[PDB]
Each structure stands twice: as C-alpha cells, then as structure tokens.
C-alpha cells in the first residue's frame, strides 16, 4: 500500500518533469559556434610524494595548494615557485580527502580512519599540529569542504553526511537518506545549500540551515564518483562509473545534458568547471583528462601525460591554471 | 635574481625533500600485510599471538623485518569502493574457522556460514586489483574441528563429501576446495596453514610466505620472470 503510494508519487514527479520540459538544451545551444580546439601546455611539475595522490584543493589566493598522499603526508605547495611550503605527517597513512580553508588558516584531511583532522597553519610555535579531531563517523570519510573557519561539511561511508562545529568538536547537523555510500560533495558560492552524490546513482541537494533534502536527482546507471557546482550556483555536473557525465539544473530539476563518447568505457574520477563554466574538465581512468564544451556536448581538448590513473583535478579560483594529480605520484599544472 | 627570502624558501624546500626521501625509504622497507576474514575467525587471538576504530594497525618486527598488518574488519561500508587503496600490498592473510559449518546464522533461510566464507574468499581472490597478490590462508579451531568431525559428520551441511569421519581427510578436502576456489593458479600462490597455539609456528610460516613474495618481486625486478 505504502510502496504503491511511493510508486504513484514518483510517477507523478516523472510526469511533471516530462510535461515541464519543452525544448532541449542541445537544440537551443546548437546555434552558438563551438569553442574549437583548446590546447593546454604543462607549466609546473611537482615531485616528492613517492606514493599515489588522492586529493588536491586550491586555495582562494590561487597560489597555494594542498595535496594528500599515501605515505602519510599532506604537502602544501607554492605553485608559482615549485617550492614546498608545508609537509604535515599524518597519524593514519590511508587518506581519501583533504580540504583547504578559504582563509588558509586550517587544513582538513580524512580517509579510512573514520576521522576528520583539522590542522592549524598559523600557530606561533611554527609546527603544524593536530588542532581538532572530529571522531564520530561510522564509515570511511570520502569528502570534506570548509565553509568557514568554524564549520565543515563531511561525507562518510555510512551513507550519511554531517555538519560539524570545529571549536565545539560535536556534529551540529546530520543528513540521512542515501542508501549508497556518499562519494563526493560540492559547495555552492552562497554556501546555504550543497549537493552530494552517492552509490545509489542519485544526488541530493541539502539545505545547511534547515537540514532536509530539497531536491533529488536520478538518471545515472552506476555509482556517482564526483560532483561539482556550476559557477552561478544554479546547476551542477555529475560524473559516474557508467562512463557518462550529466548536467542537472536546480530550478529545472531535470537532466539538462549528457556528455559521453563511444570509445571511452572507463569511469570518471573527478570533475571541475572553468571560471566561465564554458569548459568542463574531467579526469577519466583512460590516463587522460578530457575538456568538454559544456554548451555543445563535444570534446574540446585532451590532457595526456599522466602514467597512472588520474585521481584528482582542480581549477583554481581565478581560472588561470588547472592542477591534476594521479597515482604516478606527480602533480601537474596545465595552462 | 631570486631574493634572499626566496633562496631561504628553496633551502626549506630542499630540507623538506630530504625528510620526505628518508620517510619514503623507511616506508619502502616496511612490509605491508592486509588482514581479512569473518568476525568469528579469531583475528584478535592470532594478532595477540603474533604481536607477543576503522583501520587497526599492528606493527611487529620479525628477523629484522618490519611487518605492518591492517585489520579492516571494523568497517561496515561497501568493500568495492575502498578496496583499491590496498593494491600495493605484499600479501593478504585471510582467516576462517573450520568449525563454522555447524554454526548457522539466525536467519529465516538457514544458511551455512562456511559457504559464506567460500563466497567471501571467491570475491577477494577474483578481484581485479589482486591478481598477483599472494593469499595466506589460515584455518582456525583445529581441535574443536577434530572433536566436531568425530561427533558429527560433514555430510549434513553439503552432501558432496562422502568420506568417512576423520579430521585429516575432511580438513584436506576443505583445503583442496579452498585451493580450487582460485581461478588464476599461475599468478597467485595460496599458503594454507592450520592455526595452532604456538607463536613460533605461525609467525615463521608468515615470514616464509613473505620471503617467497620478496623472492618473486626481486626476480621480477631483475627480469627473469
């Protein structure tokens, strides 16, 4: 009875989505000229990890960047001069995410230890020590992103998300609902809402203040590994293990466009937008990072040069460079 | 060209590079072992024998060889997403209990826990990330298994076994079935040793299997294979 009611309601939502859509985005954007060929040369090569890299995050000053490796190190890099700024030894070697604060005061990290560690960088003593330990997740930490210097949103392998207060140390908000492991999350610029994708092939939009799910986006065939907002905060792209990428609009609440090509059957590790949002960069398991034209659903460029599985990709705040990290222990900067 | 502060930053970067190189060499020497099995296998007991939330790291030194053993049993998350992290592992030690076949989980459909261990071993062994990784298989509770096979026949759980009641024949049949679960014999050796309450007997067998893996890796590095 209840299951039938749920099937009825979701059928009504599907019918509303069908009726609401009138003109395809590809048909409307067909008229505009394609961007062409975008070739990005390597500028800097970063070495010294000696293990596979899992996570990088750009700072808001567009110069420093943090990187997480499987030797138990967080390395904070000066991208212009190639010099290393910080080298933080970690308690747990296994790491799967690392967040760089917007102010730059703190660095978060997490992985298979079920702990989110907050490290202060502006200490008077001059040694980067463990400031905060956020114990309480039941599954592995998959992604974490700072909102301010006191509040952090984390996703975990117990199918939940959490909003934590750093100074108190307790979790202030818990988000439940996903049946599969939440693999990634992305923050909007206003930061009042955040979308997260899980291993149930769906993404959910969560309100930070209220604490409930505002919107639910389905359409993928496999586990969603990556998610990122469009720079206007009204849309977001998802990458999944089914060798496709999708674009979902929050207000439209439907699948705008799908990016895929026949030759590539491997999954999508990470995704990021350009400053204008015209280019969508995504690293795949084919040892390459493809730059897609967002409005034409066609390939605009290829970043080849990594010798192992590309694990992480980030476009900087002013859009002047893109940094890619891979399992070959090298960080590369493209421009 | 570069300012004095920039030169000092370069010197700091060089010192950090030296520290990272030393840490990388020290990590390179360390032998990593991944521990798997069921909850009732006896992981805590065997780890306490060898030594004397989330990931449980055990560090012990045998014959001037460093072993770090990662117990991942605590995590309840889906294994497929985080299994790829453990690709660079020397060996996987998989522990199961021989007395599991009589024990039956409290479910509506009565199922054999031994067959669940068989499915677990088949899933771990046939994983794409672990094709050249050796498996050290440990069979636990040998005395209780001998008493149980004396009291109760093995015909009741699965009918295929028709041999007379004997710990030797039945244990060898379970061992050969576990070896038959392997689908790539050429690129994966399986070391089966019956667990006993002796510190020397176990740790030495683990050291011998790790020694064989190091021999295989050195031969691949030289290029004979």
């Amino acid at each position, epitope marked *: 009875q209840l299951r039938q009611e749920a099937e009825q309601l979701k059928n009504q939502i599907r019918d509303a989505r069908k009726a609401c859509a009138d003109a395809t985005l590809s048909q409307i954007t067909n008229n505009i000229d394609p961007v062409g060929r975008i070739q990005m040369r390597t500028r800097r090569t970063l070495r010294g990890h000696l293990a596979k890299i899992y996570a990088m995050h750009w700072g808001t000053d567009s110069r420093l960047l943090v990187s997480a490796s499987q030797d138990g190190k967080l390395i904070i890099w000066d991208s212009y001069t190639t*010099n290393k700024v910080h080298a933080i030894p970690l308690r747990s070697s296994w790491v799967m995410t690392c967040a760089y604060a917007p102010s730059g005061n703190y660095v978060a990290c997490g992985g298979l230890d079920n702990i989110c560690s907050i490290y202060n960088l502006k200490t008077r*003593e001059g040694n980067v020590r463990v400031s905060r330990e956020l114990a309480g997740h039941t599954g592995y930490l998959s992604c974490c992103r700072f909102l301010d210097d006191n509040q952090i949103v984390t996703s975990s392998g117990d199918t939940t998300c959490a909003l934590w207060d750093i100074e108190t140390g307790q979790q202030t908000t818990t988000f439940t609902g996903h049946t599969g492991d939440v693999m990634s999350l992305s923050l909007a610029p206003d930061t009042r809402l955040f979308v997260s994708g899980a291993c149930d092939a769906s993404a959910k939009l969560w309100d930070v203040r209220e604490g409930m799910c505002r919107q639910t986006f389905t359409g993928h065939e496999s586990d969603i590994n990556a998610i990122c907002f469009f720079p206007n905060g009204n849309a977001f792209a998802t990458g999944s293990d089914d060798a496709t990428c999708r674009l979902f609009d929050l207000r439209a609440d439907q699948e705008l466009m799908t990016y895929s090509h026949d030759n590539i059957i491997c999954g999508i590790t990470s995704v990021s937008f350009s400053k204008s949002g015209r280019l969508l960069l995504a690293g795949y398991d084919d040892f390459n990072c493809n730059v897609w034209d967002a409005l034409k659903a066609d390939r605009a460029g290829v970043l080849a040069g990594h010798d192992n599985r590309v694990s992480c990709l980030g476009v900087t705040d002013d859009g002047m460079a893109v940094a890619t990290g891979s399992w070959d222990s090298f960080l590369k900067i493209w421009n | 060209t570069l*300012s*004095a502060e920039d*030169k*000092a930053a370069v*010197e700091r970067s060089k010192m950090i590079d030296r520290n990272l190189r030393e840490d990388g060499e020290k990590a390179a020497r360390e032998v990593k072992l991944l521990l798997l099995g069921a909850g009732e296998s006896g992981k805590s007991t065997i780890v306490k024998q060898m030594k004397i939330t989330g990931i449980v790291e055990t560090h012990f030194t045998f014959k001037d060889l460093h072993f770090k053993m990662f117990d991942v049993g605590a995590q309840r998350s889906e294994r497929k997403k985080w299994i790829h992290c453990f690709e660079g592992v020397t060996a996987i030690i998989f522990c199961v209990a021989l007395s599991d076949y009589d024990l039956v989980l409290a479910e509506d459909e009565e199922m054999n826990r031994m067959h669940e261990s068989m499915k677990l071993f088949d899933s771990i062994c046939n994983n794409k990330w672990f094709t050249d990784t050796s498996i050290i298989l440990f069979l636990n509770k040998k005395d209780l298994f001998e008493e149980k096979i004396k009291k109760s026949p093995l015909t009741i759980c699965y009918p295929e076994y028709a041999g007379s009641n004997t710990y030797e024949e039945a244990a060898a049949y379970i061992q050969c079935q576990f070896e038959d679960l392997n689908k790539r014999k050429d690129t994966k050796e399986i070391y089966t040793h019956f667990t006993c309450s002796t510190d020397t007997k176990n740790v030495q067998f683990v050291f011998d299997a790790v020694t064989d893996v190091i021999i295989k890796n050195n031969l691949k590095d030289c290029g004979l294979f």
Partner: single-chain antibody
Framework: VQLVESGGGLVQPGGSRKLSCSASGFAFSSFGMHWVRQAPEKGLEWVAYISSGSGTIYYADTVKGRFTISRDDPKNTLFLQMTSLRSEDTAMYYC??????????????WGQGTTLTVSASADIVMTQATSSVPVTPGESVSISCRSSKSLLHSNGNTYLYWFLQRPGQSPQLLIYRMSNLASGVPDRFSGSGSGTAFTLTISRLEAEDVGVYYCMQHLEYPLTFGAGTKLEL
C-alpha cells in the same frame, strides 16, 4: 615562545666571550636565527644570521672573521663566540627567530637582550630624515622612510619591515612587507608608499605606542637599518 640570553658582564678589550641563547616553547630547529646589536644611545644594528640546519651563514662586514655563530638543535641553544673584541662592541645584543616561506612573518619575535660593556652589491642606506616628533594622543601621525635602492623586487614584494621599540622593553615587529600587519598588532598602524618613499600612518593614536620606529630593508645581505624616529609626549 621564549628566548633568554646569558653570558653578559664586563669584558676586557682583546679578550674573548661566548654568549648563549636558550629557546623554549617552540620548534627551534625550523627557525633561522639573527643577532642584532644596539648601541646605548643610538639605533639598532644587524650582526649575524644562521639558517635552519646551518646551511647558509651571513655576517656583517664589520664583524666578519671575528665572530662565529653556531647552533645546537637537541639542546635548543644558539651560541656566539666573540674573539678580539673592540671598543665599539659595548652594546646590547638581541636574538631573533625568523621563518621564511610564502606568507611567513619573519622577525616577529625578539629576545630580551644581553648587555656587554668593554669600556665605561651597493650597501642600501636607509635614511630616517626626522629624529623626533612631538605628538598628542588622538591625532594621526605620519613617519617617512627612504631607501638608497628600489626595494620593489620583480616578484612583486617590497621588502620593508616596520619595527617599534618601546622604552625599556624589547622591540616588536609591526609591519612585514609594507602591507601586512604582524600577528598581535592592532589595526591602528598602516604602511603605504612606493619605491624610495615609504610612510607609516598611525590613525587614532593611543597610549603605550610611544617608542622608536625603525624601517628595515630585507632585499639583500647585509641587512641595514634606519636611524630610528622617536615619538614623545
């Protein structure tokens, strides 16, 4: 964070003396170290620098060959061996910790000073044009400094540091790289200007700000200080 110096007292000319500075409550091995001298009724003067890990060592030319700096990291101690002292060395010596990376604040923490008495590339010349300005609490005060060489480097940083020495206390850093305020300094101070012409503006003058203000270049060794503008009431 604490630095205390020992080895003071009177010394005969032509003798030898070893000073030692002990550091507590911070990672001594990661900081470079400075010795800075102060004449009794004159400005400050830089003596020497040792990097972290002892990889590079710098000396002033007046003290080149006579003074030997060293550090012991397991005991967290800095040593200065002084041979063949002269009548100009009757000065108070401060130890300074400094860390160098992108965004760092070097010269932030100053020692307490050990007094020693023995008798009772083109050098960038830093020029404090004024010497004393009488001020009243409340008005905004401007202090001018000038250089002999353009301190604007090609990376975009201008290496000018502003220091305040209170009467009878250790000097503190106010401004590093002419724009950023040092950690623990109120927002009353602001630095502005360009190459060869620099200005410190103190809006809403408040008590305990009376002291001597120093402008320092940090473009190339040897470090050369300013004369020192004093304020009074």
């Amino acid at each position: 964070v604490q630095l205390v110096e020992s080895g003071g007292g009177l010394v005969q000319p032509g003798g030898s003396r070893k000073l030692s500075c002990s550091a507590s409550g911070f990672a001594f091995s990661s900081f470079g170290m400075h010795w800075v001298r102060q004449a009794p009724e004159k400005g400050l003067e830089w003596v020497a620098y040792i990097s972290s890990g002892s990889g590079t060592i710098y000396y002033a030319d007046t003290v080149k060959g006579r003074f030997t700096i060293s550090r012991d990291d397991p005991k967290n101690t800095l040593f200065l061996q002084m041979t063949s002292l002269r009548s100009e060395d009757t000065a108070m010596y401060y130890c300074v910790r400094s860390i160098y990376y992108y965004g760092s604040s070097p010269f932030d923490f100053w020692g307490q000073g050990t007094t020693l008495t023995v008798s009772a590339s083109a050098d960038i010349v830093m020029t404090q044009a004024t010497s004393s300005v009488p001020v009243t609490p409340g008005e905004s005060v401007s202090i001018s400094c000038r250089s002999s060489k353009s301190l604007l480097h090609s990376n975009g940083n201008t290496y000018l540091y502003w220091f305040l020495q209170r009467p009878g206390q250790s000097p503190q850093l106010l401004i590093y790289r002419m724009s950023n305020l040092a950690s623990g300094v109120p927002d009353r101070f602001s630095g502005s200007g360009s190459g060869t012409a620099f200005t410190l503006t103190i809006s809403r003058l408040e008590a305990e700000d009376v002291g001597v203000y120093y402008c320092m270049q940090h473009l190339e060794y040897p470090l050369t200080f300013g004369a020192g503008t004093k304020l009074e009431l």
